[PDB]
């Protein structure tokens, strides 16, 4: 079985400057609170060990999700492009933006497009100026992304902002309503508001869900899996959130889940493949 | 066993001018997403075939829920009365209002009463002037309805408005709080906010839930069925949302759910009968 | 197995003036709707029968949560401290505040501390002027409590206020964010917003959950138990909400729950012992 991990941040270049690597202590406590042991590759910050674990898990490719955050640390978009070009068979680059203004957002989007990157990651709740995903100042960017076929990853689950209002499903739903042709991926799957996000997915055909780490032994698990076996088969994206979860143990667990095999193939690989090929029109 | 469908919109007269029939592409998309195949009678727009499917499903009566909506299309209240008087042993009429002002809401309620209809349907999130169910402008109407024993159906689940805020349980909860003797039916059962709406129903004894289409293989399913076997036995209403769901397959699926027979009788007909007899006091 | 009941209001001087005892009719209607029969000790208002019922269920100690409320009645803090001193082996006193002005709140907090009580209960949604738990006017009190190691019980589940907004998880989450060293216990466990509150508890290590009566055959049950068997073993507190639930039947049922033995020990008594010993640093 082929697997594309929709959230894999390798221990390479600028990724090591993000808090996921600069604060191994915080990360490891989070990993253990979830129910996993830290991945040896993550703890040793070894790309070599990561590649072994990746192959042993059955993961053929990883989506290298960029990050630019005052709160959570930063990897340069140039470094994300550099990691992907170094291993072009193994990695897909996703650029990120941290902006106070709409002009800063477009300058950075253009920087991303100049690197050949065609997907962007927005985590505005952990920016220097924290904002909701439906903040007015982000609307010109969504307009650009919608017009140019750029899919948008947005962190609308987990600790997406200062408090739980930053995950209320009203924020992602407004964006989807206002930009009906914009391809959106919700990283952390808008957890914990899971009954609600399944409705949003039901209503808004261009939303993909990626609960990633929060799929594991938490509220909403059964809701995600039920939807996976129905309409969400084409719109769920497998992801480990590595280094937050181990590649091996998360994937092995995932493959045992009662998701019907045709939906399993879509969720593990098929959907990501379609989205990644679609990116940039 | 007697079955009263609390949400059946027949392919007859002005019902055929509503988006549920004028846009079968939108309807069939939701139907297939739910996991059903479109009903032959819906696709054919045949009242004859609907009567066949209705009889085969074991459904003796349907509640013809009128609709007046800029977004979703409209059926005159006179058309609704006409359908019911044409088949008085098959159909119960429910009037609908679309208003910008409280006086327009009154004038339409009076028009409904003049037709001998004694239950009203409000879907204010899909009006030309969209509003929440707890909008100040609707309060005079709720006052009149409470004082005159008129049950109100209100769409507070599913795609009730422009975005998910139109299903936030705060809106229905305030209405129930401010009008504690007003009989209220939440059509689509305030889905997706199911953990929340069970609390609301627990607290507000005048609230009836009708999850209808959204009971099918979606989040909250087990919460609704748990409540149905306990305190909500007297306050849940069977409904298909036909033409959104086929009569046969929905009803056959409903009939095998784990609901004790005395709650099952109430939910299939007993609760609807009491409400229909109550209506107009 | 030793048990500490984190919500047990005895039929003793003062507590008898609250609506839990002055309206046995409303109370018994709730108890039966939940699915229990009223405790004989509650019905007969006998401290004598209560101790028998406690000992039979294995409840060694009860937390006599004081109440000061316009909506739900009041019991003076002196009366709470006097129940505890009459039975020092059986009862832990918890003070309560109802205040309009913060100088009223601070005089009441001082009174509590003078009475030897080291835990305060806040139910601001049921005060004469209802307010949310994150109301700016409560921040001085939280700051005092945080600096002086006073744990705060706050009712943020159930009928915590006039409507469901008074249990929206944004309110408790803000308090927890702005007072990260404050020990907070959510009485009624912030039910019905269970998927959400498990995230809040996951994020906010100072939060303890006591779902009490709402654990029983209601939405969120499986979420609470799953949390109890994972990260929340150290932060869940057994309680019956007596007289709302019978000591005998609630406790017997709770003991049959699939909670791993070391978590069962912590939740039944260990967590409370720790909290009660910590109280007042
Ligand atoms: Na919820």
Contact by Cβ (8 Å): C5, C61: yes
Beta bridge partners of B65: B94
Answer yes or no: do B168 and A170 touch at CB < 8 A. Answer: yes
Please choose, from the candidates C274, C186, C198, C189, the residue with its C-alpha nearest in 3D space to the C-alpha of residue C230. Answer: C198
Q: Phi/psi class of residue A252: alpha, beta or left (left: φ > 0; alpha: ψ in -120 to 50)?
A: alpha
DSSP secondary structure letters along chain B: ---EESSB--SSGGGGGSHHHH-HHHHHHHHHHHT-PPPHHHHHT-HHHHHHHHHHTT--EEEEE--EETTTEE--HHHHHHHHHHSTTTEEEEEEE--SSHHHHHHHHHHHHHTT---EEE-GGGSSS---TT-GGGHHHHHHHHHTT--EEEE-SSS-SSSGGGG-HHHHHHHHHH-TT--EEEEGGGTT-HHHHHHHHHH-TTEEEE-GGGGSSSTTHHHHHHHHTTGGGGTB-----BTSS-HHHHHHHHHTSS--HHHHHIIIIIHHHHHHHHS--
- CATH number for the domain spanning B19: value is 3.20.20.140
CA distance A49 to B174: 57
Please choose, from the candidates A105, A26, A28, the residue with its C-alpha nearest in 3D space to the C-alpha of residue A73. Answer: A26
Q: What separation in angstroms does the CA of C281 have from each of A247, A276, C144, C149, C277?
A: 43, 56, 12, 4, 10
Radius of gyration in angstroms for the set of CA atoms belonging to chain A, rounded to a whole number:
17
Phi, psi of B147 (to 5 degrees): -70, -30
Dihedral angle over CA of B108, B114, B120, B123, nearest 10: -20
Q: What separation in angstroms does the CA of B232 have from each of B93, B206, B227, B259, B262?
A: 25, 11, 5, 11, 12
Please choose, from the candidates C199, A196, A190, the residue with its C-alpha nearest in 3D space to the C-alpha of residue B196. Answer: A196
Q: Long-range contacts: A248-252, Cβ < 8 Å, 24+?
A: A248/A39, A248/A53, A248/A56, A248/A57, A249/A36, A249/A37, A250/A36, A250/A213, A250/A216, A251/A3, A251/A5, A251/A57, A251/A58, A251/A59, A252/A57
Residue B39 has which token pair? 């009903």
Nearest C-alpha of chain B: how many angstroms from C218?
A: 7
Residues of C with CB under 8 A from a CB of A: 169-170, 173-174, 177, 194-196, 198-200, 202-203, 223, 226, 230-231
CB < 8 Å to A132, chain B:
none
Q: What separation in angstroms does the CA of B125 have from each of A236, B7, B68, B99, B144?
A: 29, 18, 11, 11, 21
Q: Phi/psi class of residue C42: alpha, beta or left (left: φ > 0; alpha: ψ in -120 to 50)?
A: alpha
CB < 8 Å to A35, chain C:
230
CA distance B95 to B81: 8
How many Å lie between the centroid of ligand 1 and the Cα of residue A223? 12
Residue C120 has which token pair? 């305060």
CB < 8 Å to C159, chain B:
203
Nearest C-alpha of chain B: how many angstroms from C139?
A: 25
When CB atoms are compared, the residue of C173, C195, C230 closest to A193 is: C195
CA angle A192–A198–A201, rounded 5-degree value: 120
> Solved how?
X-ray
**Resolution of this structure in Å:** 1.8
CA distance C242 to A61: 56
CA distance A131 to A139: 12
Residue B146 has which token pair? 């409470």
Answer yes or no: do A195 and C199 touch at CB < 8 A. Answer: no
How many Å lie between the centroid of ligand 1 and the Cα of residue C193? 5
Please choose, from the candidates A275, A265, A215, A207, the residue with its C-alpha nearest in 3D space to the C-alpha of residue A239. Answer: A215
Radius of gyration in angstroms for the set of CA atoms belonging to chain B, rounded to a whole number:
17
Buried/exposed code over C89-112 (b: 16+ C-beta within 10 A; e: otherwise): ebbbbbbbbbbeebeebeebbebb
Contact by Cβ (8 Å): A142, A97: no
Please choose, from the candidates A253, A108, A121, A248, the residue with its C-alpha nearest in 3D space to the C-alpha of residue A187. Answer: A121
How many Å lie between the centroid of ligand 1 and the Cα of residue B278? 33
CA distance A121 to A67: 7
Please choose, from the candidates B241, B260, B261, the residue with its C-alpha nearest in 3D space to the C-alpha of residue B251. Answer: B241
Please choose, from the candidates C154, C155, C147, C150, the residue with its C-alpha nearest in 3D space to the C-alpha of residue C183. Answer: C150
Tell me how far the alpha carbon of residue A62 is from its chain's centroid. Answer: 11
Answer yes or no: do A169 and B164 touch at CB < 8 A. Answer: yes
Dihedral sign computed on CA atoms, order C148, C153, C154, C156: positive
> What range defines the domain where residue B162 resides?
1-281
Query: Token pair 């100042």 is at which residue?
Result: A137
Residue C274 has which token pair? 């720790």
Contact by Cβ (8 Å): C53, C248: yes
Three state DSSP letters for chain C: CCEEECCECCCCCCHHHCHHHHCHHHHHHHHHHHCCCCCHHHHHCCHHHHHHHHHHHCEEEEEEECCEECCCEECCHHHHHHHHHHCCCCEEEEEEECCCCHHHHHHHHHHHHHCCCCCEEECHHHCCCCCCCCCHHHHHHHHHHHHCCCCEEEECCCCCCCCHHHHCHHHHHHHHHHCCCCCEEEEHHHCCCHHHHHHHHHHCCCEEEECHHHHCCCCCHHHHHHHHCCCCCCCECCCCCECCCCHHHHHHHHHCCCCCHHHHHHHHHHHHHHHHHHCCC
How many domains does chain B contain in total?
A: 1
Please choose, from the candidates C183, C102, C91, the residue with its C-alpha nearest in 3D space to the C-alpha of residue C135. Answer: C102
Buried/exposed code over B48-74 (b: 16+ C-beta within 10 A; e: otherwise): ebbeebbeebebbbbbbbbbbbeebbb
Contact by Cβ (8 Å): C225, C257: yes
Peptide bond into A76 cis (omega under 30): no
When CB atoms are compared, the residue of B34, B162, B192 closest to A195 is: B192
Answer yes or no: do B177 and C163 touch at CB < 8 A. Answer: yes
When CB atoms are compared, the residue of B199, B223, B231 closest to C164 is: B199
Residues of A with CB under 8 A from a CB of B: 169-170, 173-174, 177, 194-196, 198-200, 202-203, 223, 226-227, 230-231
Query: Token pair 């309060």 is at which residue?
Result: B139
């Amino acid at each position: 079985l082929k697997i594309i991990d929709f959230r894999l941040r390798p221990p390479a270049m600028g990724f090591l400057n993000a808090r996921i690597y600069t604060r191994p202590d915080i990360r490891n406590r989070f990993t253990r609170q979830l129910g996993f042991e830290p991945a040896p590759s993550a703890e040793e910050k070894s790309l070599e060990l990561m590649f072994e674990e990746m192959a042993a898990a059955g993961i053929e490719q990883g989506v290298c999700v960029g990050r630019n955050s005052s709160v959570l640390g930063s990897v340069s978009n140039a470094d994300v492009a550099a990691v992907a070009k170094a291993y072009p068979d193994k990695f897909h680059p996703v650029g990120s933006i941290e902006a106070a203004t709409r002009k800063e957002a477009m300058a950075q989007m253009q920087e991303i497009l100049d690197l050949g990157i065609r997907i962007v990651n927005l985590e505005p709740g952990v920016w220097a100026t924290p904002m909701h995903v439906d903040d007015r100042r982000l609307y010109p960017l969504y307009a650009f992304c919608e017009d140019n076929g750029i899919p948008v990853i947005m962190m609308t689950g987990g600790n997406a902002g200062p408090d739980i209002t930053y995950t209320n499903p009203e924020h992602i739903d407004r964006v989807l309503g206002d930009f009906p042709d914009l391809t959106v991926v919700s990283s952390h799957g808008n957890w914990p508001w899971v009954q609600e996000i399944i409705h949003v997915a039901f209503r808004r055909p261009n939303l993909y869900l990626s609960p990633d780490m929060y799929l594991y032994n938490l509220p909403g698990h059964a809701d995600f899996i039920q939807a996976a076996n129905s309409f969400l088969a084409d719109r769920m994206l497998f992801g480990t959130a590595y280094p937050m979860c181990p590649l091996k143990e998360y994937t092995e667990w995932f493959l045992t889940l009662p998701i019907k095999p045709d939906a399993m193939e879509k969720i593990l690989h098929g959907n990501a493949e379609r989205l990644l090929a679609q990116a940039g029109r």
